[PDB]
A paper describes a structure:
Phytochromes are a protein superfamily in bacteria, plants, and fungi, and function by photoswitching between states that absorb red light (Pr) and far-red light (Pfr). Conserved over the entire superfamily and exemplified by the phytochrome from D. radiodurans, phytochromes share a photosensory core module, consisting of PAS, GAF, and PHY domains and a bilin chromophore, which is connected to a variable effector module via helical linkers. Many bacteriophytochromes are histidine kinases or phosphatases in two-component systems (TCSs). For the single-particle cryo-EM experiment, we used a fusion of DrBphP with its response regulator protein (abbreviated DrBphP-DrRR) via a 12 amino acid tether.
Homogeneous refinement of class 1 followed by local refinement implemented in cryoSPARC v3.1.0 gave a resolution of 3.6 Å, and local refinement with a mask over the PAS-GAF-PHY-neck region resulted from a resolution of 3.4 Å. The modeled structure shows the signatures expected for the Pr state, including the PHY tongue in a β-sheet conformation and the biliverdin in 15Z conformation. The structure of the PAS-GAF-PHY domains is almost identical to the crystal structure of the corresponding truncation of DrBphP. The cryo-EM structures presented here are free of these biases. They firmly confirm a head-to-head arrangement of the dimer for bacterial phytochromes and indicate that the bent conformation of the photosensory core module previously detected in Pr crystals is the one that is present in the solution.
Residue numbers in the entry:
A (entry chain B): 7 to 130, 138 to 519
B (entry chain A): 7 to 106, 109 to 130, 138 to 519
Write the structure that this text describes.
């Protein structure tokens, strides 16, 4: 639930109440364009940006109280065709204008409810080569390099980087291209507090936003409330939408003049950003932004292709080792024997230190394992767990009672044959020395200050109770075992009923 | 395995030996450009198209025996950067030239060789991209595509052609000129698009025929002297069309062709296929626009299909959720999955059902006679996977072609493995009429060349049923997991029964 905005009457936003900021309703725009709201039926003007009078070059007595039919005679018929009543608010329409007072204008329109938002901005063979270059990258780190070079070339920005999210919403810079004699942010990881959750929800909907100037003063809308609904006007799909005042402070301390980002969306989920900085105030032309929007879409396809090629490659190293195992667990009638032979080796398939088997109603260990009573502690925890696969790199965090059992078991991968964890397998990876290079500060040191942090330098933190993280192609290998074992469970039942049959008869 | 080409010494291609035609090595180009092959290291010219002398406007004594350094001084450095040794042959590079009019040069590398293609040259795409992303369903998306493509290209007919899992295609959307025939809805055999052609159209994603009544222009010398072998022209756009397919478009009465491949998750999904009545040449800078749209579509197909399934499966929400709870605590499936209060016949819109647990079978609804049940089950045990899905049973199993009245359609899942325990939904026989565009699959192997008729043809199909909506197959595979999942509890219990009866 969001707090009301400042103009209506709401509380002051700090680091504590961050999630509850109405970013999508600022009631203000960035001062390098003009904004008009009109009725989606009559064509009568309802709101103006305060700067619109001069930018379009007319007396505001005339603008307030006029039809879109009289202002844009060539466009108003064309506009009503493209955006019919009851259309998604993500749908946009663009056209170019020859306004004599200014010169050349680029008009961008979209519909929200019974309302039209109008955005005005001044305006005036490599993309084909770039598209073909992305499709012929070998791996993923190769694809991310081609992206950053290509974007820096077109835009002429100081720094361009590809920023990728983890499943816990802390991001990592995976590739970077910059000007010479500058700091390097590559490899650095960042907390889940820099990008709030409602902002992540927005960046899945609309796929581009920017800040032309970080030291700019915002321009209000008049009248401030939409008189149709007597409510604040939603500016989510508007590009001239003023930036959140909190984030503006952040870019000042990092010492940035201008920002831009394009969202990468894989299968209806936010995957990462392409984030650009410049040292000085800098305005990108609107016809160049369009090129960036195509590249965002091309990437969103090629991310899928390269990731699925990385897994298939890895899993072709473990081919014969997989195939002999799969044959041995498909004819097993006693798993406590066939899955314990060192001649098969289940420790090497997963590159694990130890293993805990559990079938029938007992348990048996291979390799390097915790002491005996501590095994029964671990298993007791797994029975409460929801799914059919539990995967962790740090065990001490998920389970604090087993934070002392790091030397043998820091890492864990567990699969449940059948359901309920009556029967399972558990691979164990030992403790490792870990050093994570945080860009700025650790997650605990992001909630101390009333505003953003000052330091953005390379920070080293020693993490304890961590292990070697699981390659995704190994998790895919495990889930294929989990199927074979659960599959041949039917034969096991079959037999025992026939045993039961005799012993009922006796 | 392919036959050798005509110039080396191979057999004449007919309808019998179609799969064995070397399409990717014709040794000829379409006469509206020029083609040069050069060494990828020295830059020395090795092959010319016979028409190249005049098109580029030079004496062929000069062209043969020259460097690319002397011909394109501004390009030769730039070209060696873009295409390094050992790069995929799908990678392309383009640039524009001011030849005393204007030329568009397109280059790609195959092995130790460079292919050069020459062609003459001289705000809506942004609107189209946004319109595709805001389409409600799939048939709505396919309509936006066909309108948008007809507008830019100005072609007579544009249509989206989608493949079935058996490689017979169906026209799902269409936009055309007025006073013309309508191909929409018509289905076509798996013999019109051969299999090696399908293999090619997954690699390179555009091809065209500028003129159907054109004579092909040969290459000189005809064999690449580097390898003493025919020069591969797969990635070349000026590549001459197969002579068989040229005959086909003449009988359909087409002047010019173009197609763009739609590729979903490393598989061919469909084509965008365009015709014109007269010879017509598309400019190269307009083709580039079409190539972007092909890529945009290939993403949006995925989004709209996954939205169609999720929509359907939200109608069957409570009916699914009650069932899933009942088969997760079952200790006797022969009881809990037989109550009409649960109803498994309605979840799948089926006429009948055959259950099988323990070691016997029990039926609900409308089912075949008793000895014929044991015929059907005997067949399922030989079947490979864990799900068998068919609309026509008589084709997959000819011994049960007589059991159409009760069981024309089938969907069977195997709890566990081996078909010891399974469930089988049955759909009854239905009157079916399929509108073939031209002729049926049996009437495509008679003639020595292509067919003449392309009119609406009606065939009465017998032994067919209502086909399964994909959201129903997704519903079935989620049951197959619950039943197999709770098999563990079933075993657990019986061992403890066994425990007592061992003790006695
Ligand atoms: C090296 C990589 C890197 C990182 C990790 C990074 C983060 C980052 N923040 C972003 C946005 C926002 N952040 C906050 C708020 C807070 N964030 C904090 O730190 C505290 C003080 C806080 C609240 C108490 C809000 C409200 C917004 C939404 C702004 C709007 O849409 O109006 C964006 C997207 C915008 C863009 O691309 O320029 C990025 C990419 N900036 C970098 O360059
Ligand atoms: C209304 C829908 C409709 C259909 C179904 C249709 C067919 C069709 N076949 C295509 C291609 C080829 N066909 C054949 C050969 C044969 N075709 C036959 O019928 C028999 C005689 C036969 C061999 C025994 C060969 C070698 C090729 C490869 C061409 C090459 O790449 O050189 C293409 C794609 C190319 C394009 O769009 O132009 C289409 C779209 N034309 C339509 O517009």
């Amino acid at each position: 639930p969001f707090f009301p905005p400042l103009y209506l009457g709401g509380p002051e936003i700090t680091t504590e109440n961050c999630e509850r900021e109405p970013i999508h309703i600022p009631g203000s725009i960035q001062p390098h364009g003009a904004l008009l709201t009109a009725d989606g039926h009559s064509g009568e003007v309802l709101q103006m940006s305060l700067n619109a009078a001069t930018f379009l070059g007319q007396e505001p007595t005339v603008l307030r109280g006029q039809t879109l039919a009289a202002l844009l005679p060539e466009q108003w018929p064309a506009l009503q065709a493209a955006l019919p009543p009851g259309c998604p608010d993500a749908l946009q329409y663009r056209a170019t204008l020859d306004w004599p007072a200014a010169g050349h204008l680029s008009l961008t329109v979209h519909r929200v409810g019974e309302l039209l938002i109008l955005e005005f901005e001044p305006t005036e063979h490599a993309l084909r080569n770039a598209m073909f270059a992305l499709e012929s990258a070998p791996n993923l780190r190769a694809l991310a390099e081609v992206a950053t070079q290509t974007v820096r070339e077109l835009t002429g920005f100081d720094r361009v980087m590809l920023y990728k999210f983890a499943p816990d919403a802390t991001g990592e810079v995976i590739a970077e291209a910059r000007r010479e004699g500058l700091h390097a942010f590559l490899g650095h990881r960042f907390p889940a507090s820099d990008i709030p959750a409602q902002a992540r929800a927005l960046y899945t909907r609309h796929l581009l936003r920017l800040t032309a100037d970080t030291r700019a003063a915002a321009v209000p809308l008049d009248p401030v409330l939409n008189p149709q609904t007597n409510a604040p006007t939603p500016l989510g799909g508007a590009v001239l939408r003023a930036t959140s005042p909190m984030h503006m402070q952040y870019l000042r301390n990092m010492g940035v003049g201008s920002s831009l980002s394009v969202s990468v969306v894989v299968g209806g989920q936010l995957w990462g950003l392409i984030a650009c900085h410049h040292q000085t105030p800098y305005v990108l032309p609107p016809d160049l932004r369009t090129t960036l929007e195509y590249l965002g879409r091309l990437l969103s396809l090629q991310v899928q292709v390269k990731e699925a090629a990385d897994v298939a490659a890895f899993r072709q190293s473990l081919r014969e080792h997989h195939a002999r195992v799969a044959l041995a667990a498909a004819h097993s009638l006693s798993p406590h024997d066939t899955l314990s032979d060192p001649a098969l080796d289940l420790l090497g398939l997963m590159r694990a230190g130890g293993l805990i088997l559990r079938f029938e109603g007992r348990w048996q260990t291979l390799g390097e394992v915790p002491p005996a009573p501590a095994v029964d502690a671990l298993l007791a925890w797994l029975e409460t767990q929801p799914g059919a696969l539990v995967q962790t790199d740090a065990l001490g965090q998920l389970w604090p009672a087993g934070a002392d059992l790091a030397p043998s078991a820091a890492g864990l991968l567990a699969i449940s044959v059948g359901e309920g964890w009556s029967e399972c397998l558990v691979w164990l990876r030992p403790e490792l020395r870990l050093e994570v290079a945080w860009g700025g500060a650790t997650p605990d040191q992001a909630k101390d200050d009333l505003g953003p942090r000052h330091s953005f330098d390379t920070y080293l933190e020693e993490k304890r109770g961590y292990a070697e993280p699981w390659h995704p192609g190994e998790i895919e290998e495990a889930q294929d075992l989990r199927d074979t074992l659960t599959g041949a469970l039917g034969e096991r039942l079959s037999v025992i009923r026939d045993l039961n049959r005799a012993l009922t008869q006796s």
